[PDB]
Design a protein around this ligand. Structure first.
Ligand SMILES: C[C@]12CC[C@@H]3c4ccc(O[C@@H]5O[C@H](C(=O)O)[C@@H](O)[C@H](O)[C@H]5O)cc4CC[C@H]3[C@@H]1C[C@@H](O)[C@@H]2O
Lengths: 119, 112
């Protein structure tokens, strides 16, 4: 069974930095591209980052290129998201999702992890 | 950046009802070689989104046959023949026809 689990959410400091983790199981992690999607409190969804099998970022929103980093440790079967200079627009629910080629988008999502920017 | 307008944002239903939710693309999805890469995700409250229908009409794993998708170009639809309780959540259309992958505003299927 395809399972994704995000961790590391909570209260983060304004202007600070964080590392979100996503642990995958039930599929060959390394043969798949991965992404991070966030859901703001408005219920609006945005693709934060995409990474290929090989651990190379294939996409970042223009608005985020600079304070966002997506990496993977295939060996750990973990996907990471690192954001710096957090602002209040960073307050959202973060999900890791798998990019299925046939669908040509996300087929499986994790449960989510909540990041609450504070001052 | 392509805008996916979903109408109605709120659709109060009675169970056993036939629903149709709309998703309009700001740009044609048949403008490239990635012809109608329009998908639908359900997000029941507390749970993570689930792929419902991908590529306009292709039902994904775990999806009942009462769900169907249609449309092409900019006007896409999603029907639920008989609406059950388990169908109630938030519906997001999405597109991967054009970079960057974009999500809709959502249609909230709620009981009345
Ligand atoms: C997000 C995106 C649309 C979706 C695109 C997608 C979707 C599924 C996918 O599946 C992967 O396809 C690979 C392949 O085609 O060989 C397979 O190896 C993998 O196992 C599989 O996970 C790969 C890709 C590659 C680029 C992605 C784009 C980058 C952005 O610019 C754009 O907005």
């Amino acid at each position: 069974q395809v399972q994704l689990q995000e961790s590391g959410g909570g209260l983060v400091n304004l202007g600070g930095s964080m590392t979100l983790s996503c642990v995958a199981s039930g599929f060959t992690f390394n043969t798949y591209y991965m992404s991070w999607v966030r859901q703001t409190p408005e219920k609006t969804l945005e693709l934060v980052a995409a990474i290929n099998s090989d651990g190379e970022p294939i996409y970042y929103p223009d608005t985020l290129k600079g304070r966002v980093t997506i990496s993977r440790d295939n060996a750990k079967k973990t996907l990471y998201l690192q954001m710096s200079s957090l602002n209040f627009e960073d307050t959202a629910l973060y999900y890791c999702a798998r990019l299925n080629y046939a669908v040509y988008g996300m087929d499986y999502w994790g449960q989510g992890t909540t990041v609450t920017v504070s001052s | 950046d392509i805008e996916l307008t979903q109408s109605p944002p709120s659709l109060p239903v009675s169970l056993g009802d036939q629903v149709s939710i709309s998703c309009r693309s700001s740009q044609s999805l048949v403008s490239n070689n990635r012809r109608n890469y329009l998908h639908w995700y359900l997000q029941k409250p507390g749970q993570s989104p689930k792929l419902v229908i991908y590529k306009v009409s292709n039902r994904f794993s775990g999806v009942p046959d009462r769900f169907s998708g249609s449309g092409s170009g900019t006007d896409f639809t999603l029907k639920i023949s008989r609406v059950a309780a388990e169908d109630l959540g938030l519906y997001f259309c999405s597109q991967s026809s054009h970079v960057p992958l974009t999500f809709g505003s959502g249609t909230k299927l709620e009981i009345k």
